[PDB]
Write a protein that binds this ligand. Structure first.
Ligand SMILES: Nc1ncnc2c1ncn2[C@@H]1O[C@H](COP(=O)(O)OP(=O)(O)OP(=O)(O)O)[C@@H](O)[C@H]1O
Ligand SMILES: Nc1ncnc2c1ncn2[C@@H]1O[C@H](COP(=O)(O)OP(=O)(O)OP(=O)(O)O)[C@@H](O)[C@H]1O
Ligand SMILES: O=C(O)CCCC[C@@H](S)CCS
Ligand SMILES: O=C(O)CCCC[C@@H](S)CCS
Ligand SMILES: [K+]
Ligand SMILES: [K+]
Ligand SMILES: [K+]
Ligand SMILES: [K+]
Ligand SMILES: [Mg+2]
Ligand SMILES: [Mg+2]
Lengths: 97, 381, 381, 97
């Protein structure tokens, strides 16, 4: 199937956030990601939040394009993989241990 | 309870504009709404700060005083968290919540001096290097900025819903004044600085005030603002100016130049320039004037070294700024910039995230730009 | 030959003070010594820069113009390296080396505009994001600072040992003036700006100059300096002031306020403040005034957007600075700070090392401090 | 013997440098080192240079204390090791492959 991968879900980035606009992507498909890099500007009602990568890897696919308003909590925003050979395998869209 | 701290420290603060405070207070004023906001916002802001205090060098974290601040914040945090699942529909909740706000504010009365003793204790007892110095600086700006912000929030709620049918400043909206006359706050800040300067130096310069309202030429300059913040900045700049002037001229025959205030208003900025002929400061020293506890007074009006950086926090708090420019040998200009428009006056708040963490776990890096030898080769052979 | 670039790029530049230039030229003036220094220093400085130009985004590196600059630098570098093992004891070497310096300088005549076309070509042809913008800024400040420095070095040697027994400025030491009268350079810079403003606007403000020599009260203010650098900064600030004033008042009845220059001298600083009543600039915009090619002129006296950042490079080059403070709705102060003491006036030079590399391979980080929503919740319900 | 280790020699940090004052140490015995970290201020006749670590590891021992003027080129300044268990082994003073 697909290789080991993680889906980044949109969290409640504020105690009352229920949705957010994906204002800008800060990483490009194919770029390395370390714990804490800036991934995206998420705009709400209350702030423009810098969303940080919580897990190190590589950006495989963006599921939710820039500009998409009103993305609900829990929406997969994008896909992370463990090695950069595994990116190409996601062009057309439990061993993470 | 540290998981609660982790979690709330990861939430982003919700910066509010003066417009919002004013529109909420004037047009709305729903106690329920305020409660829903604060019971969540206060813990977020507190947790963001606590996370940072935890990143301080262990030798500072170790001082009794820093421990006290931590426990105070922790006690406040825990006390607000009791409300996360309490219904605003019950009036009792609302009422006790108000009491809790009062309580946390009183507890947070000592915080500014306690942290100061904290770092003073530390600076004088442990050797001090510049990596750690700019770090304490960075921490303190942020830590005190949040303190300003909690106090702002708590003041709005208590002033609004305290139900005090005898308010000190009736036409205000909490602590916001919709028509703050700027020259009046300048005059007050000045008279109160004069008093203190006159008490010790037996003399004080005169104030001269001038205005230019480019927005509407002959009209007095008014802005929507928290008067006490404006007052504080002015007071502090005036004490500096008076000291500088009086000290320079006490051995002269010239007699004392005035302290000149120019207040201007444009499309975007309200600018207030305080000018003195107090001798100025060489360029090399301008930045450090803003270090907590940098002082040239006997360690008079001066001593602590808090006046300039704290004043600059009040200015930056609502998207303004405070800048200083000197001509060494003559005098200094100190300029407060405010937003003209309340719709543009957003809280500027410290966020704990990886960027902040990085500031605390930085490490000296090579200089970008060259430095000369402390003993350069004598080019005379 | 890239190993030679790697190696020299890893050497540190040797910053020189005005004192050293002056002491070398006055008391020493040994051609051999200068040659031993320059044959090594020039390649170091060149290699430090080339290493940085190589780190630019590929789409900028790709422009014909950037390639040209690279090859020019490479050709110069290779031409200086021919001397690393040539004896200063032979007079021929010394002589040809002088010719080589002249040659590289002429070749480096076009460099400033060629790089400008470079980045203009790029900014307008490829989309532009702020990560890459502050990077080009960082590169350009450094790249142009080295250019100032090569020219400084080459000028000293050629003026000293060019053997020209008919020198334009006889009592100078190369291009250094031991008694540069500051108000005279101010007046000259002003008259030459006036001419240009008068030619297009049919009118120009008057200059008023004032001095205060705290060092020695009635005495004219003199400093040891490169007059042409001082001239350049002043010229550029005056054109800005004249434009701002003339544009504001062309529709008024008031008649044109003067441009006021205050020149002061203290223990450490020589300060020059140029003040205009030309309407000022809102605080939000002050930093970007210093971006290469930020201009509000039809894209008159203005257009390029180089005047302010280049002037600030001349100021920072010898440990001075150039700062701007406005009161939006009235006018602006532009202040040049120089070191009073030549012994304190060291070259400030870009060093290529890991710190620099890091600036080019940075990556957007989360903001430290909060930002509001572009559409905040209407607090009126 | 001692575990795999590297001696950091004082290089010619300027084309004409022949000696340098070890003005300050920027890393402490036991601290991690990545390629390019600042290791020491080296003062000469001509500049105060920030000397950068050229190889990643751990600082095991400082051979030349702060303040030592006139250190000749090629003087071992300190010792680097590949793992932080290997530090203690240097208290009292070819598999680097
Ligand atoms: N207008 C001024 N002219 C000259 N020097 C000034 C001026 N304002 C500030 N300074 C310098 O900056 C220093 C620190 O300023 P600051 O107000 O922060 O602390 P303090 O005045 O020294 O004590 P306090 O905490 O009550 O303000 C002063 O001691 C003085 O050296
Ligand atoms: N004294 C001033 N008053 C108001 N605005 C100013 C002043 N000086 C500079 N500015 C602003 O800064 C901008 C850029 O300044 P700068 O001199 O760098 O470029 P330019 O004047 O626009 O063209 P040039 O390259 O020849 O200088 C100006 O276009 C103007 O908007
Ligand atoms: O949420 C968000 C908007 C909050 C508006 C109400 C604020 S002003 C609570 C009273 S401090
Ligand atoms: O080396 C070092 C000192 C150099 C002094 C001579 C310089 S000024 C060469 C002429 S530019
Ligand atoms: K946070
Ligand atoms: K201070
Ligand atoms: K270098
Ligand atoms: K510009
Ligand atoms: Mg003070
Ligand atoms: Mg210009």
């Amino acid at each position: 199937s697909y290789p080991p991968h993680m889906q980044v879900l949109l969290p409640a980035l504020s105690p009352t956030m229920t949705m957010g606009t994906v204002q800008r992507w800060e990483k490009k498909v194919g770029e390395k990601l370390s714990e804490g890099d800036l991934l995206a500007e998420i705009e709400t009602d209350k702030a423009t939040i810098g969303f940080e990568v919580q897990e190190e890897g590589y950006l495989a696919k963006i599921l939710v394009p820039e500009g998409t308003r009103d993305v609900p909590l829990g929406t997969p925003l994008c896909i992370i993989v463990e090695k950069e050979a595994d990116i190409s395998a996601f062009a057309d869209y439990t061993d993470l241990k | 309870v540290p998981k609660q701290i982790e979690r709330y420290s990861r939430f982003s603060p919700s910066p509010l504009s003066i417009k919002q405070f004013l529109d909420f207070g004037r047009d709305n004023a729903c106690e329920k709404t305020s409660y829903m906001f604060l019971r969540k916002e206060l813990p977020v802001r507190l947790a963001n700060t606590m996370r940072e205090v935890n990143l301080l060098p262990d030798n500072l974290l170790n001082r009794p005083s820093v421990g006290l601040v931590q426990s105070w914040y922790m006690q406040s945090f825990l006390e607000l968290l009791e409300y996360e699942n309490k219904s605003p529909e019950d009036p009792q909740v609302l009422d006790n919540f108000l009491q809790v706000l009062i309580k946390v504010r009183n507890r947070h009365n000592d915080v500014v001096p306690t942290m100061a003793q904290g770092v003073i204790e530390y600076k004088e007892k442990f050797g001090f290097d510049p990596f750690i110095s700019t770090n304490i600086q960075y921490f303190l700006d942020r830590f005190y900025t949040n303190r300003i912000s909690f106090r702002m929030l708590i003041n709005q709620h208590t002033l609004l819903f305290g139900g005090d049918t005898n308010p000190v400043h009736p036409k205000h909206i909490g602590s916001i004044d919709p028509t703050c006359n700027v020259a009046d706050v300048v005059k007050d800040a000045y008279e109160t600085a004069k008093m203190l300067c006159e008490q010790y130096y037996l003399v004080a310069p005169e104030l001269e005030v001038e205005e230019f309202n480019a927005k509407a030429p002959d009209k007095p300059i008014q802005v929507v603002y928290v008067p006490s913040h404006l007052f504080h900045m002015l007071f502090e700049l005036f004490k500096n100016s008076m000291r500088a002037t009086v000290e320079l001229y006490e051995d002269r025959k010239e007699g004392y130049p005035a302290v000149k205030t120019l207040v201007t208003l444009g499309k975007e900025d309200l600018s207030i320039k305080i000018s003195d002929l107090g001798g100025g400061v060489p360029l090399r020293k301008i930045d450090r004037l803003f270090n907590y506890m940098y002082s040239t007074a006997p360690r008079p009006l001066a001593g602590f070294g808090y006046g300039l950086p704290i004043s600059r926090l009040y200015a930056r708090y609502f998207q303004g700024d405070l800048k200083l420019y000197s001509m060494e040998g003559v005098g200094t200009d100190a300029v407060i910039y405010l937003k003209a428009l309340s719709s543009e006056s957003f809280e500027r708040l410290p966020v704990f995230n990886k960027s902040a963490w990085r500031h605390y776990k930085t490490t000296p890096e090579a200089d970008d730009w060259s430095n000369p030898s402390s003993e350069p080769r004598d080019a005379s052979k």
